[PDB]
Design a protein around this ligand. Structure first.
Ligand SMILES: Nc1ncnc2c1ncn2[C@@H]1O[C@H](COP(=O)(O)O)[C@@H](OP(=O)(O)O)[C@H]1O
Ligand SMILES: Nc1ncnc2c1ncn2[C@@H]1O[C@H](COP(=O)(O)O)[C@@H](OP(=O)(O)O)[C@H]1O
Ligand SMILES: CC1=C(/C=C/C(C)=C/C=C/C(C)=C/CO)C(C)(C)CCC1=O
Ligand SMILES: CC1=C(/C=C/C(C)=C/C=C/C(C)=C/CO)C(C)(C)CCC1=O
Ligand SMILES: [Ca+2]
Ligand SMILES: [Ca+2]
Ligand SMILES: [Hg+2]
Ligand SMILES: [Hg+2]
Lengths: 342, 342
């Protein structure tokens, strides 16, 4: 009973997209009345995700990407698992199901994906083919494969409107937002990390695409505003990335309270030390460096990258800065939505 | 020591021009005893252009407009640059100096030019002002600014009589001629393209003006006859547009030999494929679509349009057709100038 249509990109939209992602085989469509950008393969599973059976022990960590998902995942996993740090040494990608991870790969275009790499011959092919096959599996079927006697930890960048309405009746969700200018920067570098972008494009080209609602799972503010509207719900915790930076212990204590777990001061500090940036970036369980072994990550880029707020000012000229200002102001008019650092 | 005088259009001439181009702020004068139609700002540089210092490595591509100039510029530039296709990816407007480009713009009438656009609010104003400023720079001074250690590639629609006499003692020139009926049609669509025409004017009105010597840089036949009289000079290569369509490889071979290169069959075929109409129309380095981004090109027109010979028959009624026959006949009488397809 899926209520949304999709439409093709128009010429002006295709041109902005091509200038950033013209080589990349997976194309986009706009989904529903907000025109959320999904990679085409998402459509085959869209109705299944909209009707996915949920369970009372499910926990979700949701965000527009590059907004503090990985940090939160670790925190929530450890807190739910009685601070069992040993058990958390397993890869994050085996500990959470990535609901919408599949959509980026179209199995119909298998050949085209490794033309994107500068050194295809140096791939560990067994792990690469293993990765392609895993990514062929729709997220809904991944979710459903977990036995009911195992707590399901779910990661998604999908907006609330593409999942079951009233899912929060059943499941708990922690949602992260972050200043979109820093989101834009981090998303630029993350696209470079996975070879999504043309080498000839620059960050301003990325910005143009991002703030106009033409990158993956934007419009950005619509995505945030959907969660913001449900923040009052006892089963939603809306956090800001920037509060992790200002007050990590305070943020952890909020998450623990939200999830029903009492923690001592000593346990919060240990959790906080564990999320120290330099330590976490060196953590093979969460830093995605296992994928570099496979040969699909680009030189220079890292999945855990800098860990700062406000460094967008390094990338924005005076023109882009005024474009960001106008865009943010228009989108915060007639709402109580405010960002902590802004 | 400029030997020519100019006159204003008489009332009868003025009525006809004003009927087609009156909205356009830049007006015409007739220059010299043949009465070449020049936009008025030409006069401030006419003497400098008549006396421009020339250099033995200069190459000129000259024509009455819409006669195969752009294709020729590309072939000439690649042959001289050892078929370095990569370096040819820069805009043609940065690789050639347009000698007479400036004359279309009168800096005194700055304010009046954007008023001709249906949507002046959507100009990229930085790029639009940069274009105005560059067009204020007289052609001669642009040529003189190129250092002597860089080869000067020059594009012009000027007749030989307006440039230094005996220029062919020093420089090489490729001149293109084309069936004037097709030149007319192309010229009408190009006028539309840059918003030169009154939208209430039709092609017949354009033809009236064109074949009577009252459009830009006509009289048509006088222009062509000047170049044709020089076609046995070792530094003039006179080509017909129609020969590009019939035998593109043969034309390329004539150009390469003229420029002092001995190309192989394989190289000529590569240049030929590069000049395939559809590829070339979609070649952003030469199709002028960069100006559409500025906001100064009319919807439904393109600088690279159809690329056919003989399609003037779709624009000419039976009377215009005989008027064209009489005009060509009168002008080809007592000369050996003949066109391939005629
Ligand atoms: N422990 C930590 N402390 C601070 N920032 C962290 C972190 N772990 C990851 N990050 C950051 O969070 C951003 C990615 O979030 P997500 O997990 O949703 O993809 C990246 O931001 P930057 O690119 O600005 O460095 C990254 O460096
Ligand atoms: N590669 C190509 N092959 C054939 N015609 C071309 C071409 N590139 C440009 N043209 C054409 O040459 C004409 C313009 O010449 P110029 O470069 O001197 O302005 C236009 O003619 P049409 O309007 O009949 O299509 C255009 O379509
Ligand atoms: C980029 C890329 C691939 C995979 C990309 C993946 C798994 C990206 C995951 C990104 C994440 C987890 C971002 C943070 O949420 C394939 C392995 C599917 C194949 C080819 C490719 O280019
Ligand atoms: C038409 C026009 C302008 C410019 C026109 C140009 C650069 C035209 C070039 C035409 C060519 C290359 C014709 C064939 O060689 C300005 C940008 C100078 C300003 C106003 C205007 O109407
Ligand atoms: Ca391949
Ligand atoms: Ca004006
Ligand atoms: Hg900073
Ligand atoms: Hg034709």
């Amino acid at each position: 009973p899926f209520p949304y249509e999709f439409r093709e990109l128009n010429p002006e939209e295709d041109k902005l997209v091509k200038a950033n992602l013209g080589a990349f085989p997976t194309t986009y469509v706009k989904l529903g009345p907000k025109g959320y950008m999904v990679y085409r393969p998402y459509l085959k599973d869209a109705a299944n995700i909209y009707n996915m059976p949920l369970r009372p022990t499910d926990v979700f960590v949701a965000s527009y990407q590059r907004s503090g998902t990985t940090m939160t995942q670790e925190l929530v996993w450890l807190i739910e698992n009685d601070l069992n740090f040993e058990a958390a040494k397993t890869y994050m990608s085996l500990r959470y199901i990535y609901l919408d991870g599949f959509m980026i790969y179209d199995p119909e275009k298998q050949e085209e994906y490794n033309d994107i790499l500068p050194n295809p011959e140096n791939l560990d092919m067994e792990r690469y083919l293993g990765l392609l096959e895993y990514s062929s599996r729709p997220g809904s079927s991944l979710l459903a494969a977990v036995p009911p006697t195992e707590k399901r930890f779910v990661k998604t960048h999908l907006p609330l409107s593409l999942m079951p309405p009233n899912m929060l009746d059943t499941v708990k969700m922690v949602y992260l937002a972050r200043d979109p200018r820093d989101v834009a920067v981090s998303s630029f570098h993350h696209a470079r990390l996975l070879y999504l972008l043309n080498k000839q494009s620059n960050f301003k080209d990325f910005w143009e695409m991002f703030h106009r609602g033409l990158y993956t799972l934007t419009p950005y503010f619509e995505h945030v505003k959907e969660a913001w509207a449900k923040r009052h719900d006892p089963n939603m915790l809306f956090l800001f990335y920037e509060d992790y930076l200002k007050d990590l212990p305070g943020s952890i204590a909020r998450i623990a309270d939200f999830l029903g777990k009492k923690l001592s001061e000593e346990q919060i500090q240990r959790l906080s030390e564990h999320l120290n940036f330099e330590k976490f970036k060196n953590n093979g369980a969460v830093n995605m460096e296992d994928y570099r072994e496979i040969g699909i990550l680009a030189d220079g880029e890292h999945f855990i990258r800098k860990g700062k707020a406000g460094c967008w000012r390094d990338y924005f000229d005076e023109e882009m800065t005024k474009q960001a200002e106008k865009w943010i102001k228009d989108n915060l008019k007639d709402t109580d939505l405010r960002y902590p650092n802004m």
